[model samples]
Target: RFLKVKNWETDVVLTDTLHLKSTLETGCTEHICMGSIMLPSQHTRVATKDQLFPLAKEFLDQYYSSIKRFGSKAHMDRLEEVNKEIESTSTYQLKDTELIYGAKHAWRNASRCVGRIQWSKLQVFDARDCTTAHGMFNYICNHVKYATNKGNLRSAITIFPQRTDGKHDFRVWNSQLIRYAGYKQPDGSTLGDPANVQFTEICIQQGWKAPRGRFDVLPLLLQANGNDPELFQIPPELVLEVPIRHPKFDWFKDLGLKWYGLPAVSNMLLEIGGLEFSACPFSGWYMGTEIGVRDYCDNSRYNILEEVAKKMDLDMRKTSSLWKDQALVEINIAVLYSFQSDKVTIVDHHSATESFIKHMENEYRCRGGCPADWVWIVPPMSGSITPVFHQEMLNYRLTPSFEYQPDPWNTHVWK
Candidate 1:
């Protein structure tokens, strides 16, 4: 029962694979055959020489050009020789230097992330050795502690194993390393984070004991080698949370609104040189609008618009009064002010766009092009208010990049 493939071949049907487990991670690729066309496997990126050569050539060209511009030919021949080896081998590991460089560039090319200037500082933990749940949990715990940085807020990435010879890799169930609980109510309303209602419910079903709250930290569900996921609570002291409030409204803090200090996205795939690391989790500090405008103020999310509007005593019946708009601005202001007061590194939308412009210029001057999604670069609130809104952009796929993938929970064949 041998499957026809080059370099790597397998008969382990992906649809028969077992508990491997974001809108961002929602890409679903399937293995199927049409009348004349046979589709490629979607579960992993094991490349044939046909797929690998052109990719290697393109990346090597860029890599060489970068180093030559800096007046160094160091390791140029070495990488070229290594590339030939990659073309012929079924197994390969990225050199530590290349791995580090690739991770930095992936962040810089991430179309959705606004704070890319700190891309070079990403702390990449090489945890490819770990194939068990307990081992995966340890690396994640370290990621939380270091990324939190006691409210100073540093960006970090923890890379777990990649897809290999008939082996399934580790994965985290939570969309983020840290997120709040969302308990459903009798009237079909959600008590905490509505975006996470399904995820929260799953954790509870898996025997996680979460207290009743809109902002309680949900336990991390770590899966090793596609088995049943193990759930563990991140120590409260290791998590740095920012309690939110309007600068002028003392009562706002009383509403018990809080958010974690870091945004560690755990599900996105980091593809470096055609190798996809399924369990690679990355983190960066958030802009005020990321939290205040999108996460906190969205109608389907935390849904604080009506409540905040009422607290402001704005005319509820009149949309022209701009009650929601006013409250939204105040909430964003609180997020920025509170983070600063607590000595956390945070950028406002205005500042983020300003830095983004500088980043665009830097990338153009250094790499010849920059890939940006205008929809993401543009702030959700007051789109015209920021300088970024006026800019034109065209997003193109760049390999050796970070990308949205199918959520494993939805993609996995449940056993």
Candidate 2:
């Protein structure tokens, strides 16, 4: 169990018992082979050292993959060293190429990402040498600055140390490097994102006070191996934020919506060929709906669909009116316009899916087939309307891809 963050729109702490499991897909085309990422149902833990022979081989394959040679003495010697380097081995190091290519392949293998055309372009920073949490803080701040890149926005992943025993020694609790705080009010309504209200409470419980404003940015909360997770406020200058405004509605900005430039997801574990880098925080530009519809309009989070509908004077009188749909289109429009006007790098859902299909075509040509999760690949506003939705999607588990893990906890705290 190891993910934590605010602003998930629906960031849920898993209520079921935690262990290793495969992400399931119902209708399969290519004959699903969820190879190495799952464990037996009886096992209540992730793959440990005793259960790592297959994992060792997986890493070896990846190692040989990048170098393009196999079974040479260098490969054999390295193989022995690598095999001996179990998940429980005291320490190990990843090649720069491993970090770079692994990150790229991970993105390519990501079933949910529609913006993976930029996978190879991700800037990788090796912060695995960081021995302290303050060091992590400094490196993360630097990462934020470099990735933010004056609004031109570059995708990046700053990988911190991974423990040898298939467990993480350091972790960043924030879901994204930058996100808004939700404060649950006495009236049962929320100011900002209600999805984050729980995380905001955690910050408050730790002796830090949250201003609880309509647009309050939550600070960075991280922890080392055996210590208590601490919160550090990111410097205002370090964060690049976009102020939201409508394309034609001049007063839409009065709603006071804003979001940070980069979407650095820090909570998910980056399992490269079975070895887990629990602290590897990665980022890619937002695909608009993440903000416009999901975070900004979803009932549990921002719940602004009705408000926007009312503002647009839509016939919100009945559910059949489809008022929410009309309002969402304008919200999506504002997001695209605001980012473009500011010269920031942001992709609309339509553009993202089109590019994804291109990526799939290229991948399909390069490699026999491409694996995609249709539910995520298809944009929200238009499902069957997109080219991707009609195509038969391939859903199967692949290693070195981004996958979900249980939320980290000291003890059980049922949600």
Candidate 3:
């Protein structure tokens, strides 16, 4: 079956056949619409000593193809050299250019991400030489300062040392490089982002003084050479935040709502050429709905829809009032409006999905298939309204790919 999509504005029609295989094994079948559940995490990203050589050859084939030198003598020689290196030392390092290439391809192959259109725009900072937690913190601070760029965010990834023997894995304990601290109140409620309550407690246990505020930035917990994590506070000047305000309603500014400018994900592992980088943090500009709908409105998150609806003088007692929907629109607008007013880079869902559709077309032409998770690609606020929601997508795994690794605390073997 051929899937076809047409852009009425550009007069462009894109088509692709449904011959792609699902690299991920899911409960989904012909009758079961299992798009809502997360893909099972049974697929291991780590390569065993016996598995590394063949995996290296597989990756080298892709790498050579990327440079248009596939099957060439140079490609064969490079492949042979990598095999020997792994044979002698049990591991091999990628070249500077090779690392950069892998990082871009990893971003492009990230199935759940919607911003892969800008994958090639990433700036990779190599920190493989870092051997201690202090060095990791310094490198991270530089990454934060560089990526934020005083609100004009740039897409970047800083990769740390790769895992040597699985026992000495380097990791950044925080999920996002910047996240608000969550504190449990005596009334059995949360004061900040509840999603990070456990992490906040860990930070406190690691000697961070809790301000107990709604938006306090969590300290960075970095582990190097399999050592215990050390906490380091991000300098206030390096952190840029945009205050949420409405274009038409002046009272909206009084809500004290604000969010950090950077979205640097630090906990995910980067798998390339059979190598695993446990602490490669990456950043990109935010999407408005990420802040407006998920962060501000999720019942488990900030849960501010009721407050925003009340401020609009809507009758919250009746579902027919559509109070939440109206508040959601205004809040989403405020997120986009505030970021733009503060000279920060942010995109609304409509524009984000519009570009993604174009990216999908480009992907089909180049690779014949672009693996995507429909549940994650669709915006939380609008389902059928976006182009991605209507399109049939096949979810699969591709490398170099970013993957979810276990939390550092969860996997640590304490002495």
Candidate 4:
């Protein structure tokens, strides 16, 4: 026969400071109650709260004292070391077991229960209010099924922006997403998608404007390829012949348009002529000689050209005389070659560089050190502005006697 215990009670005094009454009241019910057991044959439980309090306090004191003695600094250090070792060992075990063990367990259980039990149907996914963890798991499961069915690994990987700080802030989200999508660089050895690469913060402003807003405002002419022969079309002439009739030409009128324009035209013509004559074939000669010089500066493997002439080779000096005068060009021909080779010359290197720099400088002077509203058009063909052919004539400075503004926006000019 089994003996059953019943009718056990304990009067627990709930203190206002402790707020124990509410806790006890909430906990005590048909399902849960605070009580002591009473038994037959000296198995009765005591219910005196006052008598038990001292004993409980004494027990706690003794437990704390024992812990203080046994759980010392050395013991804690040893425990930590042991824990580290166990964690390292267990992690390897866990990694090996996680997928296989779980899958096997599920398969075995399913086989044993085959028709013995009814399985609940899976719930439909609610797109609107799914937690991140749930969403990730669901996506992975779906992807696995799709990949297996198709027998292909070409399935797109879904990229979700994960908050590094785990806070759902919009600004943080935007910044992190931008970082991931736009600027991140990926490890070159990895075989993952190129889109998963880390992006870098592009210094676009440097590309747009001068280092400190100081710009050399020179006259420039943009040209359309007319009936001129390609060989005779000197670099400067290409710019100068291009009509100085762009819409924004009016802003530079005060800066003596003709004065600025002539120098730029002459500079471009001379530089290109020099490059064409020296290099023979501007493209090929530039690739071997000018580029080779640049590679030396950039710490690349130097492919030194065999010196056919002596050290004081006048022909050699003339051949690579683009950088003879620093004032002739702001940037080197080799650098320009790189810029031109990439076809970045039409936009950033040439047109955009001149316009932004001149505009910024002019605006800075006009607006007490700030950019102005007006746009400035520099001659495109002028060697002064063209990175490839601008260096030789960069030094000749001229002051504008008068300012002339060309209003291309006027219907009269357009006509």
Candidate 5:
């Protein structure tokens, strides 16, 4: 059977005439209709400079009262006195006591040398925590005790590169050895660039091979894999080339060398000494020794020591107290992978940025005040519009303008 039906459709018809009429009737009013209107009512409560003066005075008085009640007045007075004179005194003089105390504390608190029970049990004192008089007394006592312990005067000088930029090169390595080991040139000065006062050319002339270099005997012995390698290996012996001269530097006298680069006196009791060849044969397969030695020779430690020595030599050339020593210590050498660069790229860029902003905001707040408007909103105004409205409105706004038609013969009827 055939069915006949009439289809009715309605379409929106807009004209410029109606639009113009509406526009004119609207009167270009300053106010326009919105779904909702928001009116911001803000009031600032700020203290005037004059009003703040009394309030600040009252606050300070209260703060001082509380401080006096809780803190030691004598200590506070001392602090104020020191503050008043701080600029007048040289930095070294001011820092000397504190630094010495810190060093002592660090040494005392450090994981004591495992082998000696006395070393492990050593008490550490912090200068900051101790009275000035007591701190000075302890320092002098410790210094004297240390000086009385070492009988043999072992000295070492580290050679560093003369050119500041090319200091890391292997050729400079040779000069450093000569400077420290007392191997001097025919001119009576150390064999190196005299202009670069920081470069030491002592160690090379003294026959001290860098502990981790290709020529270092320990690694060579280890690599050989022979029976009882530690015992059987004959490590290269280092001989001091020149008489240990008390080079006249500014304020100190030349003493013997300590491990790394600490100076030690010949007659000191608690001597800071380097690892001897005898100690090396006993270190055996300890990984720490291997690594430490490698790091000392190849890493920044060697360079840093050399720089300090050079500076000392220049600054204290006229004084009798300039002495430096290189110490030998068991170090473990191994290939370790670490992130060395300070700059890191976060994998989650958006989240990381958000986190960074939040962190900065937190810091700002901690520093007394924050920005008036510090809110962070994602999808900035220039980006896609926010979907804060109802879903129906969203659908209506986003939908395309085409109408859908159903096939009549397929029995799908449109109501």
Candidate 6:
């Protein structure tokens, strides 16, 4: 089947027939839909010595092509060199340039990111030399400082050591480098982001006193060489937060809502060829709805929709009142307004998806396909209003890519 996206303004139609093949089974039958289900890890579990040379060759060929050196003597020489290293040591190392290229390509290959248009502008921090969890903390701090950049946010990824084998993996325990601690209240309500309660408990067990504040920043849980994870407090000065306030409403500031400037995903794996960088924490500026709609309004999260609607004096008792929809839009506006007023980087959902359409156009012209998960690409609040809602998208695996690995605690067996 062909996926067609038409730019009605330009009167241009873009068509994709090349990606008709499904790269994954996804456990969906003809009758049932499993598009929203979170599946088990699809990444290569192990890079056997027998398979190392071939995978390495495939990556090297791509790397050479990136620099317009494919089939050149330098490309051929590097290919032989990589094979020789694998022959002797059963594994090979990527040069700094290759690592940079691989990291950028991984971001570009991430089908769920609406900001993939900015993939080439990412700053790759090579933390592969870090040998301890403590060192990872130091590198991560540097990453936070650089990416936050005092509110002029920049896209960056800090890659820790790659997995040498199945047992000795390096990873971060927290989902994001910067996140608030969630505490469970006795009345079944949450004090912070409810999604983070379990991780917050883990921090408490690791000797951190629960701050009990609504926006208490959690400590970093860094694991190295398959050993136990250790916690480190991110310096408050390194984190930049914007207080949520509305442009039109004076009372909106009383809600006392705030969000971090950086959304640095810390637990995802970066897979290039057959090699996996187990702890690649990447950061990008937030889309307003990411903070306003999901973080602030989702029932499983902060759940402030009713409060916001109440403040607006909307009819909350009736479903037809559209109180939720009205509050959602206002909150999103406040999110973007807050970030802009504070001089921090953030994007509105409309602008972000508009940029994504351009990104898809570019990818289709250059690569013949642009993989996208429509469920994610559409804005959480105004799905039908966004251009992506009308566009048909193709989802498939492309490497180098990013994938979520198992949580650090789940993988370890207690002695």
For model 3, the stretches where C-alpha displacement exceeds 4 angstroms are: 1-33, 43-46
Worst 10-residue lDDT window, candidate 1: 14-23
TM-score of each: 0.84, 0.85, 0.94, 0.15, 0.20, 0.94
Off by over 4 Å in 4: 1-163, 166-353, 362-415
Counting only residues 3 or more apart in sequence or on different chains, how many pairs clash (N, Cα, C under 3 Å) in candidate 6? 0
Candidate 2, residues 1-415: lDDT per residue as tens digits? 4222121223322221111223334233356643333332211114556656565566666668557777678767766775676544733456787778777777877766778777788889998778777888999998888888898888889888765543336778777788888887798788887777777887887776888697788988887663567789999998888899997998698877888778889877777755678788888788888888888887788878887877788898898898988888899899989999998899887778778777766765555445666766777777766666665555555566665555456432323
Model 6 agreement with the true structure over 34-99: per-residue lDDT tens digits: 668665445323568898887788889889987899999999999999889888988889999999
Q: Please, what are the lDDT tens digits per residue for candidate 1 over residues 203-229?
A: 888898879777889898887777778
lDDT of 1 at 412: 57
- Backbone Cα, N, C clashes tallied per candidate: 1, 9, 0, 24, 53, 0
Off by over 4 Å in 1: 1-50, 69-89, 165-167
lDDT of 5 by residue, 1-415 (tens): 1111111121212111111111002112347632222211110001122332332233223334433542357445534544444334311112233222222322221111111111122222222222232232333234323322222221221111111111111111121111222223467543222322232222222233433221122111110111111111121232111111122332221322112111221110110110010000000011122122332333333322334345444343434443323222101101011001111111122333334334323423432211111112221111112221100110000000011111111221212
Q: Write the per-residue lDDT of candidate 4 for residues 1-415, one digit (tens) a residue.
A: 2111111122212111111101111112467532221112211101222333333223223233434644566445444543454345321111122212222222112211111011122111212222343343343344323322222112112222211221221010111111111222255332111222221112221131212211112111111111110111112322211111112223222321111111100100100100110000000011111222332222222212222122113244564653323211222333343334433221233544343343333422432221111111222223343422321111100110001111111211111
Q: lDDT, candidate 1, residue 102? A: 79
By summed lDDT, the worst window of 10 consecutive residues in model 5 runs over 275-284
lDDT score at residue 146, model 2, on the 0-100 scale = 89
Q: What lDDT is reached at residue 385 by model 4?
A: 38
lDDT of 1 at 74: 51
Residue-level lDDT tens digits of model 3 in 290-409: 999999999999999988988899989999988989999999999999999999999989898889888888898987778777789989997678877777666667778888777888
Q: Kindly provide the TM-score of model 5 when superposed on the true structure, using C-alpha atoms.
A: 0.20
Pick the lDDT winner: 3
Query: Better model by lDDT, 1 or 3?
Result: 3
